[PDB]
Amino acid sequence: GSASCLELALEGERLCKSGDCRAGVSFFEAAVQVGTEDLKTLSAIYSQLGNAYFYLHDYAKALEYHHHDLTLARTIGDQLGEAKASGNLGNTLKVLGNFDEAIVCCQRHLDISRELNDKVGEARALYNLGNVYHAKGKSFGCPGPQFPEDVRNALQAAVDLYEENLSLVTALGDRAAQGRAFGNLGNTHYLLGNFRDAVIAHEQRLLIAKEFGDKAAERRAYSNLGNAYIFLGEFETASEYYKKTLLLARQLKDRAVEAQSCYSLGNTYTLLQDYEKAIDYHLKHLAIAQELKDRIGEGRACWSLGNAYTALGNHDQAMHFAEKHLEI
């Protein structure tokens, strides 16, 4: 009973860890169906269900399970469990766009972790809280940098939280956590218009990504670095990083990222006046969007091509893609 509930839960946890959350989830549900009198165990099952559903993009279900975990942690007086549940609720509320409540929940995680002198919990909570402010500021209007004071206020609060997180994970020797904070700090600086600061942080993220052999993180960092250099007016440097993202996108067989690399390269070459290089990268993007059935990107390819040919002289091909742009 209590024993086989635990046995099912362990198997659920094994499966999620190995990348099979679909299968692990239903072992968690079976565990709940069998049930147990150990409320610490039951709480942890609910939390792992919330985590599994979050990773499966069922945020509504994730929220409900974290809420049960939180409440149960309170009934038994488990402060550590209460703090972790509050952190998980906050991360979920953030994805759902409940930024105000996300802040409260993540602050609770932080406050309890400090009350208990749990430094690992404290660092996580600072990262999470930074993420909420980051997402909040990022949610305004047009994406990218430039509008309402609250945008800047939220992003600046995220910078302060990431900097404090980074200070703490350095003292803990947590390299992976440093990479994560550097990454998010860099994008936070980017959105604030602090482009030189974005570059410094993304370079650190890059270094740590290479250290772990984390190819996805490496790709992100190059892409983010390219973006920052575009806004610095250093277009040659951007093409370099955009090219490095392109290499890894191909090596990792990630077609969508492969397509975007080509489009941003086409635009960097447009800003560098090399219109022939622009066309080449645009048609490789156009083809890839036709492959992935992405109609929105397919439209952008046509419009960009028309503009480049116009600065070259080719009036005939400029009209050809304009008629293809109207169709989509």
Partner: peptide, 22 residues
């Protein structure tokens, strides 16, 4: 110009040993 999704850090879950540590 359009640059795609900003490429933020994916969400991080370091807690798949909880039940096993209980």
């Amino acid at each position: 110009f359009y640059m795609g999704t900003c490429q933020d850090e994916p969400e991080q879950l370091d807690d798949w040993n909880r039940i096993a540590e209980l």
